RNA sequence: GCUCGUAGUUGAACCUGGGCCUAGCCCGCCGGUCCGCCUCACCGCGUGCACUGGCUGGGCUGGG
């Protein structure tokens, strides 16, 4: 049986991911939410709540800090730090409109934010200096980046070519590898911990 | 297949769909400037013409109609635009 | 010939749930339509979709719905019709929603009893 | 070289401030490059790793 | 699907975006006006003004160079023809089938293809007397095809 | 005409007016116009662009001839923006205002694009065949068309 | 008080964020018909209405820190609408009678004002930032609020800091509150990285034409009292070029004015004579920019006596080699200063 | 057997001027303090990058 529940959103739960200390985070339409579920009495009730922003897609949460990014639908991703940040720090492509779907911390190289946009396109992003980095418009339009648990620079895209296409951020001129398997659109990827497996 | 952005196909995709199948419907037909090297006039023919277009005067040509282009005559200049 | 451009928008968005893609092209658009999709996207069986022009409609779709349909003689209905038409039409009152062109606008059966409008059954998803 | 230029065009500006950023970020993560490169190259990698054990020193 | 004979075929004319510049294929659109007006003098149909101008002035369409279409712009200066051209070119057909059919009667085809004319011909006709082209009650039969003619 | 000047109008106007004489030989739309409107409210922050009101038939007459004209305007005034547009007092005016804004280049088609709720975003792209002069100047344009209309819009070449 | 009554008589029980918000707008307009109008009352009026908001909060539950970062954020009970309305009755009040501003009225709102900007609402912090700008000045005979400028100096960095865009309001706020308390108080010491990373933010903001007199308010600020260090000596190499490459006099001005108290304050003689080969470069140097320069060397010859010396005999020399038609008798007019000094 | 055809039936999309209040800033005007000017004096003027307050003066933007 499941540990504990919560009518959470409205609409679907589009993204979600769990804090540094025992806390989780869940994106809607709705706007982002943190409850505690791991507490002595059970709280259906979130104790913060976030809805300026534009409609949320995603969530990635920091590596060791209370950090973590929430990527919108406005173009942006927006940066909170938990128990002193309100709103905030919307971080975004200059003249960006299309909606970022995916977010991703790199859990090896600490300050280096991946995002994936309906423009087919990856974008990445500098914490340390708070702003866009580089942009590549692909063929078809990428579902999810993620990075590898090892190997800092590699990441990987699922996308809607049925295709996983694993790229260097250093040299985004050719794809390091590309796995070529599938027969519909490729929803989610995820590296093994181990950073060998996919 | 399944998962496509349809508000932004490839240009190479669109280039080969036929004229009222690309996402905003458009013509792939063009304008020439043509001189026929003895006069300085600068007639603007159209490139599937079915007119035998002849130049301000001098009963010459300056293509001929087909089923498809006009093939212009000869020697002919052609800047498009 | 269908004057119900709806009904062909209506045909495409069932044909592509059926057959599994993630887009469509509606080729004839409309105002209606576009409403139609602004409540499914409200209850979030539709991903995103854009107006492009020559014009048509490029729907992305979560692959969460099940069936469209419009009631083609477009009845009125009174709001103690209402809770009828609506458990005769759904196959559950939890699940999917009844499109009503009210005095309003165009919204669902729960947006109708909340701001207390009855009008005409125009369609339903679910 | 005290002597102040033309403020250049916006976008311009922000493609000059975001390629030092590609540059900042491509030297951080040519600190990496030598590590992932001995993990590639070597015959046998122990996973976990010694670094992360919550008792590493004691 | 192009109405009597069996065939969907999409032979269709292309319009293009941005109803105003066509920038480097100037001349004014007054300029434009009065070559229609006397290419309406000289006695041509809207669509063969349309098609002499693709010939050879610099054109895309009169719609977006001027404010009106053409055959708008015959009936503002009271230059247009007495049976709405599509219409004459009909009757016109019609009357040489009708004339065909005199000189050799047997032949049952061109009878047929004669009927579907006419039948065309009235689908036409309710249409435009409906949109109060044409005056009320308009025959299409030898009595006054013939008289028509041109 | 309509306007009695401001501190700027009166400079715009004697440009138009110096135009005529002391330079080329190039003059079809300079005598027969008057003053006539202008309008100077900012884009960004630090810069800003100029606008001029134009009659209705002067716009293909200025549509004769823009190349080099917006050129000396931008280097020999003030050294911003430069950009002129039809004078009007709703959908297609609109669609007039885009369309006069964008002066050499073609736009081609208008993606509205909603987001997962009710919001939604209009971005009108432009042709390929002219990019590399423009991209700086599509802010301004986005700006000059929030200014005077209210719609967000945003200009994006196609990719 | 008839006012305030059904008010709290209301929003006592429980409460939805529209109606919540509808109190705030009320609330806030009762404190703009408040600041137009018998002030001892007043004071002693707000002082108890924030105690008895005070009294009906609950001990137990209180603003709580991030679990990733671990200080406070700044952002359906709505509580804080009163604090902020008290807060905004004295703002106007304290501001409109100068026989109010007494170091004995406000020892009662020393430990008030502490949980005004210590709050994460938006609005309260925001008319605590502008209660203190108008606060700043009152010597309390012994110095009981130099805890409580420290804690809004950390506050409103760490506000500026956290907020997306210092275009917005509470930035702003936050921005006034710092800059005045660099004008006045000489016991609150500025840190080295705080600067760099609020010049760092500003630089665009400089020319910004919205917001370009608040931050150039912040900028002489800054330069009022010495501040030694790299961050303001590379961003005064770029007012350098604000001066004369802008295009409009609003904006060349008030870059003049930051650059000029820049030339009059800061104490090498190699770097002085760069400045005056920047300033005579300028002079050859586009005919506004030229103006732009030519009347900073105006104020440099009127405001400065070896100073006076050397800049009359660079200045002098290319004024004549200059020597379009404004600027030419601008610089005779120059020239001529440069033979009455 | 196919085609045309009338009563009948379904019939494309596109289509919410004036004034008042309010907040923020600017430009300008006005009263006072300080300083300066001139007037024999009375007096007035300049006077807010010296100070302070007002303006149902003008301009831009947001909200009702
Ligand atoms: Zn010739």
Redesign the pocket.
């Given at each position: 049986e499941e540990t504990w529940r919560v009518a959470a959103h409205n609409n679907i739960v589009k993204g979600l991911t769990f804090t540094n200390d025992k806390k989780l985070l869940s994106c809607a339409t709705d706007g982002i939410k943190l409850w505690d579920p791991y507490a002595s009495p059970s709280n259906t009730t979130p104790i913060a709540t976030w809805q300026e922003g534009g409609p949320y897609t995603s969530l990635s949460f920091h590596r060791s800090a209370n950090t973590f990014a929430a990527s919108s639908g406005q173009g942006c991703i927006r940066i909170w730090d938990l128990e002193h940040s309100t709103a905030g720090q919307a971080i975004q492509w200059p003249s960006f409109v299309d909606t970022i779907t995916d977010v991703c911390f790199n859990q090896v190289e600490t300050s280096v934010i991946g995002s994936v946009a309906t423009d087919r396109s990856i974008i990445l992003f500098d914490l340390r200096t708070n702003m866009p980095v580089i942009k590549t418009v692909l063929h078809f339009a990428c579902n999810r980046i993620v990075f590898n648990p090892m190997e800092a620079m590699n990441l990987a895209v699922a996308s809607e070519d049925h295709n996983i296409y694993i790229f260097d951020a250093r040299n985004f001129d050719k794809a390091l590898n590309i796995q070529k398997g599938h027969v519909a659109a490729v929803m989610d990827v995820e590296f093994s911990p181990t950073g060998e497996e996919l | 297949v399944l998962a496509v952005d349809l508000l932004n196909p490839s240009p190479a995709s669109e280039a080969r769909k036929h004229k009222l199948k690309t996402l905003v419907p458009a013509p792939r037909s063009f304008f020439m400037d043509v001189k026929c090297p003895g006069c300085f006039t600068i007639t603007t023919v159209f490139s599937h013409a079915q007119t035998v277009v002849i130049c301000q005067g001098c009963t010459n040509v300056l293509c001929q109609p087909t089923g498809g282009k006009a093939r212009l005559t000869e020697g002919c200049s052609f800047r498009r635009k | 010939?269908?004057?119900?451009?709806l009904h062909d928008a209506l045909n495409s968005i069932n044909n592509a749930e059926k057959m599994g893609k993630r887009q469509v092209m509606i080729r004839?658009?409309?105002?209606?339509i576009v409403k139609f999709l602004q409540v499914m996207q409200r209850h979030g069986y539709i991903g995103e979709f854009e107006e492009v022009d020559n014009g048509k409609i490029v729907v992305q779709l979560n692959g969460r719905l099940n069936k469209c349909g419009v009631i083609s003689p477009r009845y009125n209905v009174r709001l103690a019709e209402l809770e009828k038409w609506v458990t005769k039409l759904l196959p559950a009152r939890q699940f999917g929603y009844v499109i009503l062109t009210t005095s309003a606008g165009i919204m669902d059966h729960e947006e109708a009893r909340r701001k207390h409008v009855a009008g005409k059954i125009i369609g339903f998803f679910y | 070289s005290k002597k102040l230029e033309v403020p250049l065009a916006k976008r311009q500006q922000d493609r000059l401030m975001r390629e030092a950023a590609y540059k900042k970020t491509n030297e951080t993560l040519d600190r990496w490059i030598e590590t992932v490169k001995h993990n590639r190259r070597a015959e046998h990698l122990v996973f976990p790793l010694a670094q992360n054990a919550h008792d590493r020193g004691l | 699907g192009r109405?009597?004979?069996?065939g969907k075929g999409i032979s269709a004319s292309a319009i293009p975006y941005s109803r105003n510049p066509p920038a480097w294929l100037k001349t004014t659109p007054e300029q434009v006006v009065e070559q229609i007006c006397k290419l309406a003098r000289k006695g041509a149909t809207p669509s063969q003004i349309g098609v002499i101008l693709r010939d050879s002035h610099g054109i895309a369409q009169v719609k977006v160079v001027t404010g009106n279409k053409i055959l708008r712009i015959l009936k503002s200066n009271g230059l247009a023809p007495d049976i709405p051209e599509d219409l004459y070119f009909l009757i016109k057909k019609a009357v040489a089938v009708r004339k065909h059919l005199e000189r050799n009667r047997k032949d049952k085809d061109s009878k047929?293809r004669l009927?579907?004319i006419?039948?065309?011909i009235?689908?036409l006709a309710?249409?435009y007397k409906?949109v109060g082209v044409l005056p009320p009650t308009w025959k299409y039969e030898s009595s006054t095809a013939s008289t028509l003619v041109a | 005409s309509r306007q009695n000047p401001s501190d700027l109008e009166r400079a715009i106007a004697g440009a138009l007016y110096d135009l005529e004489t002391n330079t080329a030989d190039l003059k079809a739309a300079l005598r027969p116009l008057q003053f006539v409107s202008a309008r100077e409210?900012?884009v960004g922050h630090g810069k800003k662009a100029i606008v001029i009101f134009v009659p209705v038939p002067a716009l293909q007459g200025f549509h004769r001839v823009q190349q080099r004209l917006t050129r000396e305007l931008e280097k020999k005034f003030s050294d911003r923006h430069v950009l002129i547009l039809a004078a009007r007092?709703?959908?297609?005016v609109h669609d007039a205002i885009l369309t006069d804004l964008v002066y050499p280049v073609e736009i081609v088609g208008k993606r509205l694009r909603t987001k997962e709720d009710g919001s939604k975003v209009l971005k009108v792209i432009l042709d390929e065949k002219e990019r590399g002069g423009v991209d700086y100047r599509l802010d301004t344009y986005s700006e000059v068309y929030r200014?005077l209309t209210?719609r967000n819009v945003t200009f994006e070449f196609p990719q | 008080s008839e006012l305030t009554l059904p008010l709290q008589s209301l929003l006592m029980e429980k409460l939805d964020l529209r109606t919540v918000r509808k109190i705030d707008e009320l609330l806030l307009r009762i404190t703009?018909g408040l600041l137009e109008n018998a002030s001892q009352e007043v004071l002693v009026f707000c002082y108890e209405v924030i105690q008895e908001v005070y009294r009906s909060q609950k001990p137990e539950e209180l603003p709580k820190m991030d679990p990733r970062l671990k200080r406070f954020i700044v952002q359906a009970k709505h509580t804080y609408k009163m604090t902020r309305f008290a807060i905004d009755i004295l703002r106007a009040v304290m501001?409109?009678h100068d026989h109010l501003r007494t170091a004995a009225n406000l020892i009662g709102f020393l430990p008030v004002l502490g949980d005004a900007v210590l709050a994460v609402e938006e609005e309260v912090k925001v008319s605590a930032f502008k209660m203190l700008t108008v606060i700043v000045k009152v010597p309390f005979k012994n110095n009981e609020s130099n805890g409580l400028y420290k804690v809004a100096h950390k506050e409103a960095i760490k506000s500026i800091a956290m907020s997306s865009s210092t275009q917005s309001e509470l930035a702003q706020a936050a921005l006034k509150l710092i800059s005045v308390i660099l004008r006045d108080r000489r016991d609150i010491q500025m840190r080295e990285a705080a600067l760099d990373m609020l010049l760092s933010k500003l630089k665009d903001d400089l020319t910004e034409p919205?917001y370009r007199?608040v931050t150039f308010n912040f900028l002489?600020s800054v330069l009022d009292r010495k501040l030694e260090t790299a961050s303001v000596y590379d961003t005064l190499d770029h007012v350098g070029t604000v001066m004369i490459t802008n295009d409009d006099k609003?904006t060349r001005?008030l870059a003049?004015?930051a650059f000029?108290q820049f030339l009059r304050e800061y104490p090498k003689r190699n770097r002085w004579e760069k400045q005056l080969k920047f300033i005579v470069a300028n002079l050859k140097y586009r005919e506004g920019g030229r103006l732009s320069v030519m009347e900073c060397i105006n104020?440099l010859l009127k405001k400065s006596d070896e100073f006076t010396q050397e800049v009359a005999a660079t200045c002098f020399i290319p004024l004549v080699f200059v020597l379009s038609d404004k600027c030419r008798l601008a610089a005779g007019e120059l020239i001529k200063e440069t033979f009455r000094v």
């Open positions: - | - | 010939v269908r004057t119900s451009v004839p658009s409309s105002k209606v | - | 109405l009597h004979s069996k047929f009927i579907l006419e039948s065309r009235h689908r309710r249409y409906t | 409210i900012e007092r709703l959908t297609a200014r209210g | 703009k501001k409109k919205l007199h002489r609003d001005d003049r004015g000029f104020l």
